[PDB]
Swiss-Prot record, chain A:
Miscellaneous comment as given in the Swiss-Prot or TrEMBL entry: South Carolina isolate has been sequenced from formalid fixed-lung tissues of a 21-year-old male which died in 1918 at Ft. Jackson, SC. Brevig Mission isolate has been sequenced from lung tissues of an Inuit woman buried in the permafrost in a gravesite near Brevig Mission, Alaska. This sample was recovered by John Hultin, retired pathologist.
Residues of the full protein shown: 86 to 212 of 230
Modified how: Upon interferon induction, ISGylated via host HERC5; this results in the impairment of NS1 interaction with RNA targets due to its inability to form homodimers and to interact with host EIF2AK2/PKR.
GO MF assignments: protein serine/threonine kinase inhibitor activity; RNA binding
Protein name (database record): Non-structural protein 1
Swiss-Prot record, chain B:
Shown segment, full-protein numbering: 435 to 597 of 728
Subunit structure: Heterodimer of a regulatory subunit PIK3R2 and a p110 catalytic subunit (PIK3CA, PIK3CB or PIK3CD). Interacts with AXL. Interacts with FLT1 (tyrosine-phosphorylated) and FLT4 (tyrosine-phosphorylated). Interacts with NYAP1, NYAP2 and MYO16. Interacts with FBXL2; PIK3R2 is a substrate of the SCF(FBXL2) complex. Interacts with PTPN13; dephosphorylates PIK3R2. Interacts with XBP1 isoform 2; the interaction is direct and induces translocation of XBP1 isoform 2 into the nucleus in a ER stress- and/or insulin-dependent but PI3K-independent manner.
Annotated positions of the Phosphotyrosine modification: Y32
Linked pathology: Megalencephaly-polymicrogyria-polydactyly-hydrocephalus syndrome 1: A syndrome characterized by megalencephaly, hydrocephalus, and polymicrogyria; polydactyly may also be seen. There is considerable phenotypic similarity between this disorder and the megalencephaly-capillary malformation syndrome.
Superkingdom, natural source: Eukaryota
Known role: Regulatory subunit of phosphoinositide-3-kinase (PI3K), a kinase that phosphorylates PtdIns(4,5)P2 (Phosphatidylinositol 4,5-bisphosphate) to generate phosphatidylinositol 3,4,5-trisphosphate (PIP3). PIP3 plays a key role by recruiting PH domain-containing proteins to the membrane, including AKT1 and PDPK1, activating signaling cascades involved in cell growth, survival, proliferation, motility and morphology.
Domain remark from Swiss-Prot or TrEMBL: The SH2 2 domain is required for interaction with FBXL2 and PTPN13.
Record note on modification: Phosphorylated in response to signaling from activated receptor-type protein kinases. Dephosphorylated by PTPRJ.
Protein family: Belongs to the PI3K p85 subunit family.
The name this protein goes by in its record: Phosphatidylinositol 3-kinase regulatory subunit beta
Length: 127, 129
């Protein structure tokens, strides 16, 4: 009970990234961002988050990476607002996955994300 | 000198948290390295005491006398080293919550600064690259 799992290095967390067609939605006090100009690639969802009672407790940051490393999506707590709940993070992941898959993207969650708050079921990838 | 005053002040807090994380991580690594050093020496003192009283049991049915004081000096050093070894385990068991909370709040300040407009170059400035 009570851990802190990190999929992303400090570089991956702090790295600047640029959306061509920005699409921002808000799930609770979480800011979901993604590039609608991304299509037909395999996307991994990596996240830093704390667990408690073997559930996800607090999301620190979630980012969507392509196989080549480009950041194309993000879920983050809004800086001006208070925290979020275990359900808010799962809703934001559903928004990011469903929004990313509508552009024929093969979205996959990390192993640690799959252990505490996952979604999808996954589709096929394009060569 | 208004909303950036907060961005600069929070970026200053990111420094201090990053300093404290790397300072305590350096401390935690000194303890784990010294813990496995002593526990190995505990292992050796153990089977050295085994062979110490096993030379007694193997050659007491036939009967070389001042050897008992050596086993008594090793048993004395053994539980004296295992005592300091437990204290090392207590010192670094008390650091694991400190390393986790520091590492988590350090990352939260990074994400907060990123959301407030700080680019990767600004984050690396406060992070010491």
């Amino acid at each position: 009970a009570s851990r802190y799992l990190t999929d992303m290095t400090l570089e991956e967390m702090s790295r600047d990234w640029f959306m061509l067609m920005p699409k921002q939605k808000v799930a609770g006090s979480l800011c979901i961002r993604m590039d609608q100009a991304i299509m037909d690639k395999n996307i991994i969802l990596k996240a830093n988050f704390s667990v408690i009672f073997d559930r996800l407790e607090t999301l620190i940051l979630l980012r969507a990476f392509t196989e080549e490393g480009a950041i194309v999506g993000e879920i983050s707590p809004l800086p001006s607002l208070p925290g979020h709940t275990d359900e808010d993070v799962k809703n934001a992941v559903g928004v990011l996955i469903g929004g990313l898959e509508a552009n024929d993207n093969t979205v996959r969650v990390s192993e640690t994300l799959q252990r505490f708050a996952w979604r999808s079921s996954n589709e096929n990838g394009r060569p | 000198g208004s909303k950036e005053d907060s961005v600069e002040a929070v970026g200053a807090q990111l420094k201090v948290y990053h300093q404290q994380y790397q300072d305590k991580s350096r401390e935690y690594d000194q303890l784990y390295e010294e813990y496995t050093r002593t526990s190995q020496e505990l292992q050796m003192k153990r089977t050295a005491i085994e062979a110490f009283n096993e030379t007694i049991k193997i050659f007491e049915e036939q009967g070389i006398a001042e050897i008992h004081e050596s086993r008594t000096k090793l048993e004395q050093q053994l539980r004296a080293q295992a005592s300091d070894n437990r204290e090392i385990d207590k010192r670094m068991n008390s650091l694991k919550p400190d390393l986790m909370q520091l590492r988590k709040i350090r990352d939260q300040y990074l994400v907060w600064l990123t959301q407030k407009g700080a680019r990767q170059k600004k984050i690396n400035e406060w992070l010491g690259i």
